[PDB]
Ligand SMILES: Cc1cc2nc3c(=O)[nH]c(=O)nc-3n(C[C@H](O)[C@H](O)[C@H](O)CO)c2cc1C
Ligand SMILES: Cc1cc2nc3c(=O)[nH]c(=O)nc-3n(C[C@H](O)[C@H](O)[C@H](O)CO)c2cc1C
Ligand SMILES: Cc1cc2nc3c(=O)[nH]c(=O)nc-3n(C[C@H](O)[C@H](O)[C@H](O)CO)c2cc1C
Ligand SMILES: Cc1cc2nc3c(=O)[nH]c(=O)nc-3n(C[C@H](O)[C@H](O)[C@H](O)CO)c2cc1C
Ligand SMILES: Cc1cc2nc3c(=O)[nH]c(=O)nc-3n(C[C@H](O)[C@H](O)[C@H](O)CO)c2cc1C
Ligand SMILES: Cc1cc2nc3c(=O)[nH]c(=O)nc-3n(C[C@H](O)[C@H](O)[C@H](O)CO)c2cc1C
Ligand SMILES: Cc1cc2nc3c(=O)[nH]c(=O)nc-3n(C[C@H](O)[C@H](O)[C@H](O)CO)c2cc1C
Ligand SMILES: Cc1cc2nc3c(=O)[nH]c(=O)nc-3n(C[C@H](O)[C@H](O)[C@H](O)CO)c2cc1C
Ligand SMILES: Cc1cc2nc3c(=O)[nH]c(=O)nc-3n(C[C@H](O)[C@H](O)[C@H](O)CO)c2cc1C
Ligand SMILES: Cc1cc2nc3c(=O)[nH]c(=O)nc-3n(C[C@H](O)[C@H](O)[C@H](O)CO)c2cc1C
Ligand SMILES: Cc1cc2nc3c(=O)[nH]c(=O)nc-3n(C[C@H](O)[C@H](O)[C@H](O)CO)c2cc1C
Ligand SMILES: Cc1cc2nc3c(=O)[nH]c(=O)nc-3n(C[C@H](O)[C@H](O)[C@H](O)CO)c2cc1C
Ligand SMILES: [Cl-]
Ligand SMILES: [Cl-]
Ligand SMILES: [Cl-]
Ligand SMILES: [Cl-]
Ligand SMILES: [Mg+2]
Ligand SMILES: [Mg+2]
Ligand SMILES: [Mg+2]
Ligand SMILES: [Mg+2]
Ligand SMILES: [Mg+2]
Ligand SMILES: [Mg+2]
Ligand SMILES: [Mg+2]
Ligand SMILES: [Mg+2]
Ligand SMILES: [Mg+2]
Ligand SMILES: [Mg+2]
């Protein structure tokens with residue numbers, strides 16, 4: 216059985232790096248992280264000093 | 280990093296109050312609840328005494 | 344077996360009341376109305392005296 | 408010909424009132440506003456004192 | 472309030488049995504599992520000895 | 536001209552058998568049933584003794 | 600209250616004429632037909648002598 | 664950079680002519696109109712003397 | 728078994744004729760073309776002398 | 792690089808067996824078939840002696 | 856009230872840089888640009904010397 | 920007439936480079952490659968030494 220958690224990563228550099236940010240967090244806390252699916256991308260502009268790229272991913276991990 | 284939990288709130292009054300019901304529950308258990316996105320709405324009719332409005336939300340919270 | 348009918352309710356007050364308007368009509372004519380799923384919402388503005396909220400629902404009823 | 412503008416209204420009270428907030432703004436600036444279609448709903452939680460309901464609408468107006 | 476978890480069940484027999492595999496896991500760990508909604512189906516072919524059917528479900532459970 | 540009715544079939548055995556349950560009902564009441572399209576699948580768990588698979592279909596029939 | 604019926608019209612000439620074919624049928628049988636929304640288009644090729652254009656519409660009519 | 668405007672064209676003749684009606688309007692007011700994408704089609708029936716076909720398009724134009 | 732190919736037909740006349748253009752091409756090269764499903768429509772404007780209607784279809788053909 | 796082909800399998804028994812029918816065909820003709828994603832399911836009723844279940848899959852295979 | 860404009864940015868380098876190109880244009884002409892949502896990505900290949908990445912964004916700005 | 924092939928490119932560097940990987944393959948084998956549309960993005964994590972970014976594209980090429 217796989218389970219997915221819905222995470223939004225952020226980066227001041229790129230959408231790829233924002234996806235990595237989410238996956239990094241998942242790997243900090245979860246065992247057996249196997250894949251991620253991108254479900255949304257966006258950019259935070261008018262509440263931050265530097266534009267912040269965001270990539271939202273379903274991160275899948277194998278249970279047990 | 281943000282994480283989302285997929286919650287269905289209920290209310291005998293309105294779709295807005297049903298969204299609040301879910302958000303209330305998220306705030307009981309989670310720190311740093313930041314926003315919610317409505318993903319579905321519905322009404323339970325033939326198993327309840329009063330119609331029950333339901334609003335399903337992705338509730339986003341900031342990790343750490 | 345459940346069957347759904349696709350109804351648009353209207354209200355001069357709210358999207359919740361517009362959903363109720365559709366469900367009310369379904370219950371006038373159908374037995375065993377069990378639930379409704381919201382599939383669209385809108386507002387009629389420039390053909391009415393008062394703005395009219397509309398909520399379109401699939402209203403499910405149990406056959407037999 | 409109709410044209411649509413994509414507006415997000417806000418309210419501290421309800422999703423209906425948030426839709427009205429967008430439509431109100433459209434009517435301030437545009438002639439011949441005819442209808443609105445709801446395309447998203449959400450709630451701002453962790454940057455505001457009171458939860459703020461948001462309803463995003465395509466607001467249609469007749470050209471000429 | 473209902474909460475949903477996004478689980479992918481697997482089976483070497485059928486899509487139905489794969490849905491059951493996910494639901495079985497949810498019932499092992501959660502109280503008050505009430506329904507599941509199928510959100511994706513697929514088949515693993517070229518990393519397994521036998522084709523493996525997969526059914527991804529949102530499994531809903533009642534909180535409290 | 537074809538018309539479609541939106542039916543949810545149920546089965547304690549499989550998603551295929553649940554689709555058949557809906558189609559069976561359509562054929563009881565309608566002439567010239569020609570095809571069905573699956574539009575949703577789900578499982579009822581916590582209100583039934585045995586898990587109940589559900590398959591929702593648009594069932595198309597030829598008018599006249 | 601509006602209700603919609605899901606009809607597929609056909610024509611050997613065009614997608615517009617196929618939409619009209621469905622609407623024509625709705626007007627034969629229903630009072631107060633108000634609008635139609637196109638939801639699918641297709642072409643039947645290898646079971647007919649002439650290609651047959653099909654347009655599927657939700658046809659809305661006002662109840663009462 | 665391209666920008667899109669969301670326009671609904673109308674015609675008493677066809678969906679193609681309705682798309683042209685929107686594009687015609689865009690070309691009256693905008694420079695560098697490059698393409699259009701159809702996003703919806705419909706038919707106005709019970710407020711007009713003749714059925715009116717509607718085609719909604721995103722009309723893209725090049726900025727600068 | 729059916730297979731589909733994803734083709735975009737073009738026409739200076741209509742969306743119907745653009746669908747036919749794709750189907751014509753499929754029939755030139757494939758045996759047992761059975762149906763087509765429209766998946767997108769658009770108009771090329773600012774790289775052509777005459778507006779060019781486009782209809783993208785999945786064209787289904789029976790294998791063997 | 793992976794490539795996908797869009798195949799509809801058929802079976803007089805089940806949606807699972809219909810998916811297998813498509814995958815079987817892909818494996819007859821292609822090397823390195825790795826997975827399939829279900830994209831549609833349906834049932835042929837009024838042109839066949841026995842109901843025929845259909846499962847449409849994107850079948851992915853590794854190039855080279 | 857927020858309003859969104861639908862812009863396609865381009866870059867010969869990356870999808871991130873293409874999103875920035877659109878946002879840059881929005882900030883040239885609009886006050887109070889707050890966020891962007893990615894709605895499509897693509898690549899222009901056979902009309903340009905170098906591949907051109909494109910990212911289409913809804914760019915949101917606060918009115919007043 | 921344009922035809923599209925559905926390709927998934929991979930890269931250990933970025934989603935942009937993964938799109939290029941698919942397009943590169945298309946250009947190796949096909950004449951008149953004109954554009955690509957991104958339809959999915961993902962990351963392979965727990966079967967590879969380095970995370971592998973994937974971008975799935977419909978790659979369009981002009982026939983004849
Ligand atoms: C992808 C994305 C979507 C957003 N959507 C909204 C929104 O719908 N409403 C909102 O108030 N702020 C939204 N924001 C945040 C906004 O830019 C700003 O930080 C808030 O307005 C602060 O209250 C969004 C930010 C991002 C990156
Ligand atoms: C939005 C919504 C969707 C529902 N969908 C289903 C369904 O697909 N099948 C079902 O058995 N009950 C469904 N129900 C519950 C139904 O109204 C009733 O309580 C059940 O039939 C009890 O078994 C739904 C209820 C709501 C509020
Ligand atoms: C949600 C909604 C969508 C509508 N869409 C359309 C449309 O696409 N075309 C149209 O002519 N009128 C539309 N109308 C009706 C419009 O406001 C007006 O009453 C008509 O233009 C009368 O011919 C719509 C009304 C609502 C509430
Ligand atoms: C519907 C909605 C969606 C939002 N989405 C995002 C988002 O994707 N990323 C984000 O940083 N903030 C988002 N926000 C704003 C968030 O709540 C907070 O104000 C920001 O994090 C401030 O930077 C959203 C707010 C709303 C109401
Ligand atoms: C429904 C489904 C979707 C899949 N999608 C992908 C994918 O997008 N990329 C991938 O590398 N592997 C995918 N795989 C796994 C693939 O079959 C194989 O196990 C991997 O390529 C191993 O690295 C998928 C498997 C299934 C069952
Ligand atoms: C596919 C499916 C979806 C359902 N969705 C809901 C729902 O959204 N809300 C709800 O109260 N019950 C729902 N139910 C019914 C639920 O399992 C239980 O019978 C009800 O909670 C009884 O009130 C659903 C059942 C099925 C099979
Ligand atoms: C838009 C459209 C979709 C169709 N889809 C299917 C299908 O999924 N399976 C099928 O057997 N026939 C389908 N047909 C019918 C097909 O062309 C042929 O008449 C049947 O194969 C006869 O059994 C479709 C026809 C049209 C016009
Ligand atoms: C595509 C389309 C969609 C429409 N949707 C609606 C609607 O949702 N509600 C409505 O009141 N009128 C709608 N109308 C207008 C309707 O036919 C009639 O003109 C209005 O009811 C006048 O108030 C629509 C018209 C078209 C062409
Ligand atoms: C339906 C449709 C969609 C198009 N989308 C794009 C696009 O996203 N980007 C683009 O550069 N050109 C696009 N074009 C082509 C555009 O009109 C023009 O020919 C190109 O800009 C040439 O580089 C599109 C054309 C059509 C018909
Ligand atoms: C999933 C599915 C979808 C279909 N859709 C259509 C359709 O849209 N139009 C049609 O004429 N036949 C359709 N058919 C075929 C239909 O049942 C019958 O064989 C044809 O009407 C023969 O011309 C479909 C069959 C299946 C299995
Ligand atoms: C994302 C994207 C989508 C496009 N879609 C189309 C299309 O549907 N039809 C078309 O003629 N050109 C399209 N083009 C443009 C195409 O590559 C080429 O420039 C045109 O064919 C010039 O007429 C597209 C370009 C891009 C980047
Ligand atoms: C975007 C993406 C989606 C995937 N989906 C699945 C899946 O649904 N099931 C699966 O078994 N593996 C999937 N995989 C592959 C998975 O990470 C691992 O390689 C396989 O589990 C090997 O059997 C996917 C990989 C990617 C990159
Ligand atoms: Cl989710
Ligand atoms: Cl329907
Ligand atoms: Cl495809
Ligand atoms: Cl838009
Ligand atoms: Mg930096
Ligand atoms: Mg988002
Ligand atoms: Mg009360
Ligand atoms: Mg739901
Ligand atoms: Mg009042
Ligand atoms: Mg509507
Ligand atoms: Mg207040
Ligand atoms: Mg939104
Ligand atoms: Mg076995
Ligand atoms: Mg999946």
Ligand SMILES: [Mg+2]
Nearest residue numbers: 546547548585
């Ligand atoms: Mg049994």
Ligand SMILES: [Mg+2]
Nearest residue numbers: 575576577591
């Ligand atoms: Mg359902």
Ligand SMILES: [Mg+2]
Nearest residue numbers: 610611612649
């Ligand atoms: Mg003729």
Ligand SMILES: [Mg+2]
Nearest residue numbers: 639640641655
């Ligand atoms: Mg169809």
Ligand SMILES: [Mg+2]
Nearest residue numbers: 674675676713
């Ligand atoms: Mg005329």
Ligand SMILES: [Mg+2]
Nearest residue numbers: 703704705719
């Ligand atoms: Mg519309």
Ligand SMILES: [Mg+2]
Nearest residue numbers: 738739740777
């Ligand atoms: Mg001509």
Ligand SMILES: [Mg+2]
Nearest residue numbers: 767768769783
């Ligand atoms: Mg397209």
Ligand SMILES: [Mg+2]
Nearest residue numbers: 802803804841
């Ligand atoms: Mg048999």
Ligand SMILES: [Mg+2]
Nearest residue numbers: 831832833847
């Ligand atoms: Mg299909």
Ligand SMILES: [Mg+2]
Nearest residue numbers: 866867868905
């Ligand atoms: Mg360069």
Ligand SMILES: [Mg+2]
Nearest residue numbers: 895896897911
């Ligand atoms: Mg695009």
Ligand SMILES: [Mg+2]
Nearest residue numbers: 930931932969
């Ligand atoms: Mg490297």
Ligand SMILES: [Mg+2]
Nearest residue numbers: 959960961975
């Ligand atoms: Mg994918």
Ligand code: NA
Nearest residue numbers: 220221285477
């Ligand atoms: Na989730």
Ligand code: NA
Nearest residue numbers: 349540541605
């Ligand atoms: Na219906």
